[model samples]
Target chain A: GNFNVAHGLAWSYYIGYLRLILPELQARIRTYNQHYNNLLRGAVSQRLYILLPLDCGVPDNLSMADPNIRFLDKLPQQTGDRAGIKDRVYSNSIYELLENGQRAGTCVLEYATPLQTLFAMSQYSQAGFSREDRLEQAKLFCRTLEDILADAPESQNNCRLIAYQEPADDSSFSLSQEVLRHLRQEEKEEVTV
Target chain B: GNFNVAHGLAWSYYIGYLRLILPELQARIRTYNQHYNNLLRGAVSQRLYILLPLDCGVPDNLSMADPNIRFLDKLPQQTGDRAGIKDRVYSNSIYELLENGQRAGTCVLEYATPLQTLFAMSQYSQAGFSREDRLEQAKLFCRTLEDILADAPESQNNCRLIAYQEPADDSSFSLSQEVLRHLRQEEKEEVTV
Candidate 1:
């Protein structure tokens, strides 16, 4: 059933994709029986695409010089525990390549609670949009992104589409206590103000 | 130029109109100036449209029986002491109409400060919407609302648009000390929550 390309997309491209297509994806996912159990609360925890531009002068200071290539992910932040990490990886990712040396990727968040998925998917839930809106908006954005993903060669419809796991989650897991306290104080001011 | 409809709209009708056309109106108003100051602070303190099937026996026995034609305003709140009262009324609008059966009213806080006006307008000030977004979404809604207003009979449109004075000063002269205290408590809960 995994016939298509997997999470071969870079972090940035992947993030853009999620923002663009979420409403439609969630609308469809919610339609299935026990969708939370099957699609959301599964074997993976986070899904993402990692694209490599054939090791072109890779460095700690990255360059977005290539239009065709992109790497996207959350702006890295301190985890408060000082457990420094690098390469900005997500919880889960699947990489695949076509015969032409083109790299592709797929990702999923597995082994989690159903509510995790619900909140993750809720990221793009526009209160103003109706069910009809979700489908129509998704349809429109899907085409737009497909063109963006078009391969440099016009061969297999050009753009590569990376299949993503359901219920995307970007909620922060850790924050410095000071930032947390500041946020709480800010919250209080907003209400009392 | 006293052209177009002024606060020419009644509370209930204006509210309906806003809900219908806000996307566009907000867009344009946000453009000409700090539009909120003009639209919100003026004319009807809060624009709303409430309809009655003549004698519908309305109640607050806690009923959201809130109809398609509904308008709600603070109960003719005691502006501290009875330093004064205004013409515009609701639930308690207990009306001034011309021979043509049209209502003509202008009520004010009598004496006030700023907070009342601030909180009222704050309803639409979503942290999610940028000043720019407020305009564009409003622009979209305004286009939609104008289309609706186009359908109403000719007489209403002819009414002069109201010219509300600055910074939408809704701050009360002095509300019940208890009411003020209650509001402070609610504010704290909202922030803490």
Candidate 2:
């Protein structure tokens, strides 16, 4: 019975937050990138080249001068369209394997909640997006996410908006564990994007 | 489920004892009375007279001389043969009134193991005698009854050897409660009449 209730509530909360937060975060990242065309170009080019380890000695550090670099660095490696190429090569291999591990970490961290919510929604809502009540609840959840994101500190800004970070290395594993420990402590907090 | 097992064991013990003892007591009463023809005659006459209120009340002290008087008194007020007399007096009226009450009490008491066994046997047994394993159990019980009765005290010796006591007139309202109390007390005895 407890499992039934917990699963239901968690699913509801997940779907509720995802619909609102994901789009807003996507728009924000797009807007941020619009002002930093050079950085966006550099990051994408670097990501493409990073896949070719045979050409690599040591690559120069990608500049953080462009505002798009920050958002581009944060984009989930496994975006719905890009799919396999970056996930296996650039995201999983190069960024996750070689960098400070923050890039791959952000990819996972940004995607986790949305994916979990989608899975839960599929389980609980047989009709999926066709259910009016579920759609309404999802909207309400998004609003709640926006409210939480708006009130969050700048350092923690968009933190809840991202997918969960999959451990890339020992340091990331420790960081993820610590973040999970804190999340568990604040389990009742409203989950936003 | 626990109640079912516990209750079944209890019923087995009780009905096992009853099948063994009841017939022995009946036979003993029949046999002993054969030796005291006058007392048997008087007791049957007295019993008949009690069936009709028109007969003069026999002196209460007359019974003291015949040990069989106690057995005669203890004979159930209603039994297979005697049921007719009671039925004739009250027609279906007495039956209708008592039937529901009797059935309810019987059903409740049937929760006890022995009574339930008796009830089951009454339904499925031929002439209230079981076959196969139940019959074997019955015979063993009867043997135990015979052994016990062989050493029974003279004062308790009777053909109708059932150990139940007659309820006083005022106790009828609380018959079930009183019967339970009586059964509890009966458990202490190594042998029942």
Candidate 3:
């Protein structure tokens, strides 16, 4: 009887968490995947793969603050694993989210961020570091954060993964709407909370 | 007082001596004059004067062993001793003789021979010694030899002077046939007798 109370509250909290966290996670991962795809189309393929982790981690850090936010490092491995998947639908969908962000002129997952996450990723990929080493390092970091979340009741609230959708048009969002709805929303919430 | 039997021979010897010595002296002086003129055209006018004494002394020394041979170093101090007319002419004539010998391809005067004569003349000329001093030295040398000739009849024959003359076409010499003939005769007798 007590478990239902705990479970019910946890489930609602999870839904709430999903509403908040999943959209951001989808947005970030999608933006990253799109940039990676764009990078793939040129001489920057190897660089994209290398930068995937740091690129993913940068926005992840901006979205959430956690002492165990190590999963960012595992992003490169996840990207590498996903790279092997020949299913264009999955790749295209993932990449479309990235492209949508780019077309929106959002630098959410770009290496050009002052955080230098993308720079670190670029260094790992383009430099002489082995792919396995980079992948392993990224995997270890991501797994650590994932494990921490798995143990948290609040993390179950974050279990609801949002499906990333591409914007119908490039100009779908106005500058004010984009800033307020997405960027300033976090700032607003931080102020309110 | 009766003169010795050698007195007659001495007179004859003196005649031969004058005949031989005078023409050579004239030719040498003429030669020196020619070279001095040429030197005036060149930069070596001073050197030409300086080299004359050595040149004169060289042939003079060859004749000196002959008891009857006499060299004239001094002339009567004439008017116009104001400039080096007499001295320059005298030195120039010696220089001309050397130049002529040189032009004639004669080994009679070598290069150092004239240069040595120049060094000596320069040394003596700068020594503040008067022309009269030089003349006294010449007279002393001549008197000593003449005294020696007073004893040796054989030496008197060898003491005969030999004359030198430029060819008739020589521009320096007047083209008069009479002058030419006289010079030719004088030169021939000096050499032959």
How does each model score on TM-score?
A: 0.18, 0.17, 0.16
Q: Which stretches of candidate 2 lie over 4 Å from their true place?
A: A40-193, B1-193
Candidate 1 has a TM-score of 0.18
By TM-score: ranked, best first: 1, 2, 3
Q: How well is each residue in B1-193 modelled by candidate 3, as lDDT tens digits? A: 2211122122222332322333334334344445544865421111111112211244435223222222223222223456533323322121112222232111111111322222233243323334444343333333433554455434443332222233446454221232224334545676799
Interface RMSD of each: 23.2, 27.7, 76.1
Query: Each prediction's Cα lDDT score?
Result: 0.26, 0.29, 0.29
lDDT of 2 by residue, B1-193 (tens): 0111112222223223332333333333344445435552421111011010111112323223222122223223223365343222211000001223332111111111222232233343232333333334333333433443354343123322222223445343333343334333443342563
Q: Give the C-alpha miss distance for residue A14 in model 1, angstroms.
A: 6.5
User: lDDT per residue, candidate 1, B40-141, as tens digits?
Assistant: 452322212222211112243211321111232332333334532322222322111112333222221111111112122223232122434323322333
Minimum summed lDDT over a 10-residue window in model 2 chain A is located at A47-56
TM-scores of chain A, one for each prediction: 0.24, 0.26, 0.24
Looking at candidate 1 chain A, the ten consecutive residues that score lowest on lDDT are: A3-12
lDDT score, candidate 3, position A43 = 13
By lDDT, the better pick of 1 and 3 is: 3
Report the poorest 10 consecutive residues by lDDT, candidate 3 chain A: A42-51
Candidate closer to the true structure by lDDT (higher is better), 2 or 3: 3
